[PDB]
Amino acid sequence: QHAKILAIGTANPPNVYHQKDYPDFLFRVTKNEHRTDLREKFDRICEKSRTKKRYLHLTEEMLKANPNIYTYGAPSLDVRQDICNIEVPKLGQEAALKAIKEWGQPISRITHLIFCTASCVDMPGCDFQLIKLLGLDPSVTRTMIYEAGCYAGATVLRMAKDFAENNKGARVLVVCAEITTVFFHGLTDTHLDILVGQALFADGASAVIVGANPEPEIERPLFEIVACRQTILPNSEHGVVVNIREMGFNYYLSGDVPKFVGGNVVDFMTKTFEKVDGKKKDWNSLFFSVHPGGPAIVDQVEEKLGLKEGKLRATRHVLSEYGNMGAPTVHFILDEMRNKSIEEGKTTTGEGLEWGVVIGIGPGLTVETAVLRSESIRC
Amino acid sequence: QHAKILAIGTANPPNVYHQKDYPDFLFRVTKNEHRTDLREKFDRICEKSRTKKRYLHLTEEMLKANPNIYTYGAPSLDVRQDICNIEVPKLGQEAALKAIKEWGQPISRITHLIFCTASCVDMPGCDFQLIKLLGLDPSVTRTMIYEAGCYAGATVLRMAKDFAENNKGARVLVVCAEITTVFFHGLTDTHLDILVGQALFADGASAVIVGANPEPEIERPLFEIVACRQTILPNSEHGVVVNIREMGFNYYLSGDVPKFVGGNVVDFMTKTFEKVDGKKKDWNSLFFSVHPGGPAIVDQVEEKLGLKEGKLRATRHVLSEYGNMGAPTVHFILDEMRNKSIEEGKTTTGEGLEWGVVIGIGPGLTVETAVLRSESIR
Ligand SMILES: CC(C)(COP(=O)(O)OP(=O)(O)OC[C@H]1O[C@@H](n2cnc3c(N)ncnc32)[C@H](O)[C@@H]1OP(=O)(O)O)[C@@H](O)C(=O)NCCC(=O)NCCNC(=O)CC1(c2ccccc2)OCCO1
Ligand SMILES: CC(C)(COP(=O)(O)OP(=O)(O)OC[C@H]1O[C@@H](n2cnc3c(N)ncnc32)[C@H](O)[C@@H]1OP(=O)(O)O)[C@@H](O)C(=O)NCCC(=O)NCCNC(=O)CC(=O)c1ccccc1
The missing domain is CATH 3.40.47.10 (Thiolase/Chalcone synthase)
Structure with a gap:
């Protein structure tokens, strides 16, 4: 009896950034409108991105209050962490509540938590904060995956599989949440990689419930x-x-x-x-x-x-x-x-x-x- | 049936700091000899530490070259990371080679790697660096545990147990490694917690091989x-x-x-x-x-x-x-x-x-x- 995905929920920040508008926004809010050379390159990248819109926590007001965030190389980790250490668990919570609703079981049945983020790091971590937000059992068995990166959507399913299959009756809540405020950087022709991330990276969270031996009439595998x-x-x-x-x-x-x-x-x-x-x-x-x-x-x-x-x-x-x-x-x-x-x-x-x-x-x-x-x- | 620890190896940086000498070292190299009040408090904490000596990567020369490291609150994460992202995998490699020797099987037999550290963070991570250092199979199944902290010596055994028990024939290398250079801070009467860390925190790495169903006469459980x-x-x-x-x-x-x-x-x-x-x-x-x-x-x-x-x-x-x-x-x-x-x-x-x-x-x-x-x- 293999581990099954029993529910999937998702969430995003409320601010919608349509790609047709993002070059204008980025170059205006970072005071780079004179860099017409970089604007050309960014327009081309956005045209090729196959990305029509993105949801971002970051707002223009946050940048105005913290211009070090768009000042390339300036110290800014502390203010980024102050945001992301709070917002990443919150967005995860929203996704988790949707997954738990689909699942249809009491939160007390969750035995294991995998939290995954490449957007922040703290001790105690996001897993601890999510346990508080959701009221998970204080004895949930936790795996906190920090800074793995873009393969980890598959990795957390692999980990969940082993935890769910080796621990009879286990139910694994898997939450992946990203807030790209920590990755936002200003524009310089010495680090053009940033133009690609500025075109493609976005904010979102998923939640997946994994368990073997689905309970008939309650749980439904996907x-x-x-x-x-x-x-x-x-x-x-x-x-x-x-x-x-x-x-x-x-x-x-x-x-x-x-x-x-x-x-x-x-x-x-x-x-x-x-x-x-x-x-x-x-x-x-x-x-x-x-x-x-x-x-x-x-x-x-x-x-x-x-x-x-x-x-x-x-x-x-x-x-x-x-x-x-x-x-x-x-x-x-x-x-x-x-x-x-x-x-x-x-x-x-x-x-x-x-x-x-x-x-x-x-x-x-x-x-x-x-x-x-x-x-x-x-x- | 159950996952077994098949080997344990350990490693430490070469520099030995005897606790009897550490207050003099700390207050001299951080230019705090005028703070006799803080020195008195630190002497008391060390006396109660029940710690006779520690091994540390950090040296006086490193502090002289990077005085932001002992200047409380100064920007210093980049220099700390440049050290620890290199030194944490190296120290873990030393422990892992000792565990692998005890185990007595080829490195190519390792199917899973768990790397755990609260001393640094980087992408690719320490697990990737260790794969290169040891020549692990590029398809090892990896778990990279960053910034969990001091419960994780038990946590990594729990993770290894599930991976070993759910995957027939799996052999899990577990490596925990710490270099406290990232945690070193100077002294201020507004943050006395630093006196406790300065007395107790130390450097070291462990490696454990975990597997279920040990091979009779080839592997032996501990x-x-x-x-x-x-x-x-x-x-x-x-x-x-x-x-x-x-x-x-x-x-x-x-x-x-x-x-x-x-x-x-x-x-x-x-x-x-x-x-x-x-x-x-x-x-x-x-x-x-x-x-x-x-x-x-x-x-x-x-x-x-x-x-x-x-x-x-x-x-x-x-x-x-x-x-x-x-x-x-x-x-x-x-x-x-x-x-x-x-x-x-x-x-x-x-x-x-x-x-x-x-x-x-x-x-x-x-x-x-x-x-x-x-x-x-x-
Ligand atoms: C880019 C493009 C759309 C271009 O469209 P194309 O159709 O390919 O046109 P091209 O003919 O190739 O040239 C087009 C023009 O852009 C120039 N150009 C193209 N590439 C580069 C380049 N790499 N560096 C410099 N310049 C470049 C080129 O030089 C030319 O410039 P030109 O026009 O002025 O001549 C295409 O390539 C493509 O899909 N790339 C794959 C992108 C990729 O790796 N993503 C995976 C990476 N994930 C993360 O990092 C994950 C995460 C994270 C975390 C949390 C949340 C979200 C993320 O972030 C950090 C850690 O976690
Ligand atoms: C600390 C001792 C030995 C104290 O000796 P004692 O208990 O015999 O008598 P005492 O009177 O209490 O102390 C004497 C004087 O120090 C004051 N004082 C004591 N305690 C204090 C405190 N906690 N805060 C703030 N002031 C404090 C006290 O007020 C008094 O002041 P005084 O009147 O003398 O001026 C003991 O308490 C004890 O074992 N505590 C448990 C320590 C603990 O939890 N460690 C968790 C580790 N965490 C980490 O993260 C590890 C980490 O990163 C890492 C990462 C990588 C590698 C390696 C490590």
């Missing part, structure tokens, strides 16, 4: 977590780097990340499915939740796996409507898949298909995959 | 990880606080932490052993690895569990010879227990007893317990 694999792509340690510094969380993004993903996806998919049935081709038989680190990563997975038009629609839909929210994004994609599957009258939560995969991609470059089975659409 | 429990002690959120700031990892320590531990130990011990057995436990029938966050915490466990003289000898020995190294410390204590049991000709790795417990204590206040069984000395 997906089954079958098998998982984590690997490091060769010769790519420069792909995604984040340093936690006095200036905030500083990041570097190699232009070659999409090529590394494309050059490795057939291998890492094949090695993942060796843990199941030895599948080695015909990837269109699967449903997919691909972490949309950027649009070129999505395009590379589609091209090198030979995916048909529309196979990655749910992934592209979330990237369009929410941007890259980090680890929660693959859970938004699973939720979107489930919702569209209901809308279309599909037989399962995975677009009618039986087997699928979650692909998380982050620093290392590290790829974690989770092979899923869908479930019938019921109650 | 302890069995039977059951685990994590809990928050009521009304103690202020007990231990660490904020990751421009000035480094700043910390606050409540004077009530020992009383909180003593006020809860019977309960958290009872609730933990109820996961194993319905009979009442005799606490003196156990062997103990207690996180020595300070000497008063050890005294509180001894008192409220009614432990006989000497029951906590191994714990107190590590506190005396190494100080509070954070999460690794309870693993140093298990290693010390195993070593002393060999020396004394005991029948088991747990002082000749069958059942034991690891008690980790940290922010929340959070207590994680792991129930252990000993193994025969072979």
